[PDB]
Design a protein around this ligand. Structure first.
Ligand SMILES: Nc1nc2c(ncn2[C@@H]2O[C@H](CO)[C@@H](O)[C@H]2O)c(=O)[nH]1
Ligand SMILES: Nc1nc2c(ncn2[C@@H]2O[C@H](CO)[C@@H](O)[C@H]2O)c(=O)[nH]1
Lengths: 258, 284, 276
């Protein structure tokens, strides 16, 4: 709807900056914060509309902005719509984006409730000409052809694992390749088999577009899938929510800080 | 086009119900090989798409597709004569609307045929590949027919495609084929949709075959998705209208004429098969 | 964007034919490694009504290796947001202008592990990921004046042109740089992730790029013979642990470094094309 260029994103971010003094260093999109300011999307002009909230505050002694209310491609949201919040985070000061999502577990060693830290992704829609970055490149935010090298910051993944390991739930944590199915259908057994064989570990309908935008504008990304279902290969969340929440809090606690 | 939402679909459904007393229990999407089936419907009421306000318009070189009501083996059917292929540029709503209309009309089972290239090397020209599953390549991209606000009136936001190709219908179809002595023509496999309208390159065919795809076509899955989304049971058969070329060195090439020819040649048998499956469908 | 139908294409072709009497038999789409034509007129896209606009881009007519050529300087990439019609029109204009053979280069990532930087990979086939996923440039009403509703893509990359290309490279001392392979299109504009590259490699892809296939599909649709070469402007990184990453500036540098060789090759290829 509203082109996610520097002028429009600057407008939304400037507005939000009147609504709050909190300069978030960490962006959090969830698939508890202290001294919080809850800004409903409805309150934000030219900001995408789900009802969703942008929660600012402090988490493990860090300034965070939480996105409550997500914009999925399968809902029909445009590239710009989905990009805009992430680029706003950029202008607001977000240096690190932490994302959780629900995913089907393709990898046969995954179990319900497992955490699969994304170490890489296969952006099926992206490969198929539905990349969120298709269209004029917004040069203010990033380069025309972003590399997705170390897209899922290895250091953040290392830290997340350590945090999980140190807190006794290291057994739950895997790292894997997330493949995006544009959705909104769940994957057929044939699709899951194909996806597994493509070297995919978990499959979901979200996240990648945000990650691409985040990486495009230089926001480090941390992303974890919660395996909320085990993919069926042949045709013949609430639980782990507070664990994952605790995990995100603890990781943030140990995030480096300027 | 017009949104395949409940209001518009009701309008269309109601328009249709003014034009026929036939409450279809079975919807049939005339793909390759079914042209003759359409013609065999007893006591037809033929409703050109052009006579249905807000119904999607499609033509065969100028001639409007038709909705065909009547019976087939003693069962009330609506035959879609004229499908809306995504490669023609039809919208998700256009493709979805007729299936959702079928839902409101009383369709419980959707039978669809299509023409497909045989990726699976054991397939022969003229084989019937009952779809037991599919790989919705456009769907995996961001071109799933359900992309956009979900029409809650018709189904859930995230439909599972578990048993999309009803195993019981598949079993029945196989049994009917077996009983009638053409079981040997009958296979089951995975259909992968290539948005098209280009036939697959050999590299694409090799890739698709390695993905576990048995047949490849440009249709059907979106209809199936819409069908499943609204709880219509689906039976789908691919007619192997060509053997996919996996080798770039080959001089053989897919051409629609031969596809039509295989459809024409197998149409009688497929009609018979469908008619006989229909007669054995459970209940009434 | 104007529909790439016969009427609109004709109009464009005609306005162009006002600006030049060079009837091109060879269309060249410059990608990496291209960018010599003699007796040339440079027609900026800006001077051509309804012709797509890109940065201006030029339609260059003239003589190359004795043959009438039209060189498309300024390409239309799907990742830029260009429509099918926009990408198709110029190829269809070429067709009307008289083009028989389309020679196209591009920059691509080297997936095939035997590939080296600056290698040439003649496309012998492709995987049109956007095309499989309903983003085929031909989606929409078929333009019957140009081609059939369901084009086959067999011999899409003319085996004879490929043979000639390889022979020309061989005898001109650089056959060692020349491979043939499968090109996969990534809609882009992101470079592939390591997981994507690994998947693409495993799909049987040798090189990956964000271009070419749409034009090739349109060229084949209207019966233009196609020769296409990927310059391996970067070795795809399959390892997520690796520090190595693609870099457009390096991609550009590699292309330019090979441009002269690519030019020579294309020229010597055009040199050996059958003259009727
Ligand atoms: N993709 C693909 N579609 C086919 C093939 N054979 C028949 N078809 C179908 O039949 C028409 C083209 O012949 C299209 O509508 C396709 O859905 C094939 O080999 N590959
Ligand atoms: N998809 C893809 N395109 C590349 C690669 N290297 C060079 N290119 C091409 O060069 C430009 C970006 O470098 C795009 O237009 C691509 O088509 C690569 O590794 N992957």
């Amino acid at each position: 709807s509203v082109t996610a260029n520097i002028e429009n994103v600057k407008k939304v971010a400037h507005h939000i900056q009147k609504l709050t003094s909190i300069v978030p260093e960490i962006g959090i999109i969830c698939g508890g914060v202290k001294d919080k300011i809850t800004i409903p999307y409805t309150k934000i002009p030219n900001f995408p509309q789900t009802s969703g909230n942008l929660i600012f505050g402090t988490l493990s002694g860090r300034k965070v902005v939480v996105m409550q209310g997500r914009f999925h491609m399968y809902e029909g949201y445009s590239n710009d719509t989905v990009a805009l919040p992430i680029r706003v985070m950029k202008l607001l000061g977000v240096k690190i984006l932490m994302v959780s999502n629900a995913a089907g577990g393709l990898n046969r060693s995954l179990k319900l409730g497992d955490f699969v830290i994304l170490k890489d992704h296969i952006y099926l829609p992206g490969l198929g000409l539905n990349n969120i970055l298709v269209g004029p490149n917004q040069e203010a935010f990033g380069t025309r052809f972003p590399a997705l090298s170390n897209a899922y910051d290895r250091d953040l993944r290392k830290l997340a694992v350590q945090v999980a390991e140190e807190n006794g739930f290291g057994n739950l944590v895997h790292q894997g390749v997330y493949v995006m199915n544009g959705g909104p259908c769940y994957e057929t057994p044939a699709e899951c088999t194909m996806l597994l064989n493509m070297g995919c570990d978990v499959v979901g309908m979200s996240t990648i577009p945000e990650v691409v935008i985040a990486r495009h504008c230089g926001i480090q990304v941390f992303a974890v899938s919660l395996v909320t279902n085990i993919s069926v290969l042949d045709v013949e969340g609430a639980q782990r929510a507070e664990l994952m929440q605790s995990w995100f809090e603890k990781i943030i606690e140990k995030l480096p800080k300027d």
